[PDB]
Amino acid sequence: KIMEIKLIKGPKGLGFSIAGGVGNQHIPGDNSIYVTKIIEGGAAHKDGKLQIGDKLLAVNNVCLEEVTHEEAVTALKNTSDFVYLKVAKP
């Protein structure tokens, strides 16, 4: 089920990496965007909620379902410091 994670973006960004997207499936059959790394010392690490394997559903009202890798990257970088993530845990 779904979890809401709120983060303040640091000078280095959110501090996580992602894989997935339409045309770039992380799992065969699945276009979803997945968290692959939580960055040591970063904002996502300090907060503690986000974990590797989490599916990203949205960021700040931007849908992240059935998007390309590039669209997801662009949505995640072009945000204000106030970051709201909607996330599905395995």
Binding site: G13, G15, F16, S17
Partner: peptide, 6 residues
């Protein structure tokens, strides 16, 4: 390099 970090 292979990782895409946000």
């Amino acid at each position: 390099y292979l990782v895409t970090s946000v």
